Amino acid sequence: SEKKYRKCEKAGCTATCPVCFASASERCAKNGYTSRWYHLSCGEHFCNECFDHYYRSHKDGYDKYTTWKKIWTSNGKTEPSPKAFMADQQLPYWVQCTKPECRKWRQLTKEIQLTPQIAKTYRCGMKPNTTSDHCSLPEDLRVLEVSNHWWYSMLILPPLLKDSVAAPLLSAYYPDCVGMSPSCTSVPGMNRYFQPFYQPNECGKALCVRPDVMELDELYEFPEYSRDPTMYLALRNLILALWYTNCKEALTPQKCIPHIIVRGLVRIRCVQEVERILYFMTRKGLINTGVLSVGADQYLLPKDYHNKSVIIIGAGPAGLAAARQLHNFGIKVTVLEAKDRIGGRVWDDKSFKGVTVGRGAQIVNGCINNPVALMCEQLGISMHKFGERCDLIQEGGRITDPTIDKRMDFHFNALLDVVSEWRKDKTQLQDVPLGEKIEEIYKAFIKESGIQFSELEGQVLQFHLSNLEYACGSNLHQVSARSWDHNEFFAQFAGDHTLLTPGYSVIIEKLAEGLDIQLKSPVQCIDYSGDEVQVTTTDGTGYSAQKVLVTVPLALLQKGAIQFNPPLSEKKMKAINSLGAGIIEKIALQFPYRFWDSKVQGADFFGHVPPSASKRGLFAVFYDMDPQKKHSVLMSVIAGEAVASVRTLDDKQVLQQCMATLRELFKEQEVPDPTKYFVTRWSTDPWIQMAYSFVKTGGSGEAYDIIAEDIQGTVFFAGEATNRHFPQTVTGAYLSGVREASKIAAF
């Protein structure tokens, strides 16, 4: 009469007495003998009678199983089996007592389906969906087993979450390939800029994670998930979904737990992992970031990561970002800024009636997943997507026919295409200045083709040339042909380019809120010999801490303004000197009325066709600073060779030359005098001296990576000049501070 066993089917199982969790069949083995004891985990087994109850065609619960099967096979890629069925449909739920000093795990009865409402409110031995004696009872012994690694080793199937908050975003994916149950019959309200997941077979979008693939740095930290990442993916994806669903408060483990819905003891494992994973993504700045603020005893990282102190040099976006991160983590942070204000190259003039005019940055280039878009969401502020339209207006007042604009843009880009071909097989030593290579290709193309451009077509080509010089912040003869667009090899920020109407100052101010910031404290010296870094200001003040982070602009690193002891390495100096310190300047003009409205007809900007290639980049674009079209403020830009021509002019002389230009651009009409203006002088600001970085002839994009290497795990570097993927921008500077705060916290 066949054979029967007390013991589990799996050699090495730690259950000395399997007991059937199902009790689905009339002849369930309860806790005795059966023809096979089917193993789900070390703590969960079901007898063969209950196995036949669902499996065999002549048995009762066969319709229930066959129906689940059909749902399973059509929505998922994971095979259906009785074990998979049991784990998705028959294992009981486990929940923690929500009383703070208890937190004990309990098994719910079978008919109860775990809601996030139950998980938020459950207390020991009180019937859910609803004395303190029931808390003192010991947990089921199987609970403690779960937290060992060998428990996960002995788990036969990975968990599949139900009703994950991630699910509305992952519809393009098989639910089980991203850790969600296929038997689960279930993005309005989320910010259009939060797109944290790639769609399948999609790349080239910055800061998107693949919802079905762990990343290298994730596998490094969680190698136990390398073979089968189902479970890690489920929890990471859940945390991301929860964060972007509410980026204005800190996302705690307490907050994640009631959204982790899975049957069986494995839920305990998930609740224990979510917390580890959460602290990891916090340190890495993927969540719980932006201008989020925490109070005392509400720090974002456990007291372990708290045994450090940091001095941060420079209170620009990179410095304040690291300071805000490190502070939120619970690390002592002091920021020493040279100037008498924070912000660095973010400095918003607020004195123009009705608008905020930035003397430094005010544009966000690519808003999807951009942390600046995150921080705007957190602050409730709005960004203005730039319009496409930008007439090229001639001195004289003629508006250049758009087909000329477009045709010369074509020829121009066709020149850059030849550079990209030429450079493919050339090393850093073979490099050649970009402008020089363009002139060669152009003069070769003119000579070969016979074509003859009108004067205007040539001037319009000069305009497109000036824009490139603006993007590099340099005449193109200092810019590397090989490596000027180096960072476009990496995924870039998709989406809208915007004018940050309220100005970056609003973000910079909120980042700095509440931090120990010593202004008028320019750092003279950093000595990282000895047990602690010693930092000294220009008047002799001394500050001390265990680690120091440097965010000074590239120009200041090039000029050696801070004495380093020991000196920076030769490798680091060569990198620092291989990047160029690009420069632009800005002028803002306020008028008594919007004199351009009739001609410009609402566009966000208009173009200034340069008269000659010498005057190239002199007020090339005028920006209308009020997207609501009520106030009268224009802003324009000096780039390229034009920067060196106006160093010997005072502000009034620059203003006059701008006004002469506007009046030529509007020659057929009257232009009022300006009533208020400013002219920036970044290139002579002693502690900045630049607008943003670029790669000079002979250098490589790797220069950014090299400038970013820490020294002795003790001196760290951040700043736009240190972000290889995202050079130049406030965004790239911000992310580099987060990057460095992640490095520092790791110790």
Ligand SMILES: [C]C1=C([C])[C]=C2C(=[C]1)N([C][C]([O])[C]([O])[C]([O])[C]OP([O])(=O)OP([O])(=O)O[C][C]1O[C](N3[C]=NC4=C3N=[C]N=C4[N])[C]([O])[C]1[O])C1=NC(=O)[N]C(=O)C1=N2C(=O)[C][C]C1=C(F)[C]=C(Br)C(F)=[C]1
């Ligand atoms: C200038 C400018 C202008 C005029 C304009 C613009 C700009 C600029 N940009 C840029 C930005 O801003 C930058 O990049 C940033 O900011 C960076 O940051 P960082 O890194 O943080 O730096 P800074 O800020 O500079 O800071 C620094 C600091 O530190 C200090 N110091 C120094 N030294 C020292 C100190 N302390 C102490 N001790 C010592 N020794 C100083 O003071 C400071 O504070 C920009 N950006 C963006 O994003 N956007 C915009 O819009 C901008 N801009 C314009 O306009 C345009 C440009 C652009 C680009 F570039 C790119 C792109 Br794709 C775009 F979209 C745009």
Ligand SMILES: [Zn+2]
């Ligand atoms: Zn049974």
Ligand SMILES: [Zn+2]
């Ligand atoms: Zn077993």
Ligand SMILES: [Zn+2]
């Ligand atoms: Zn309890």
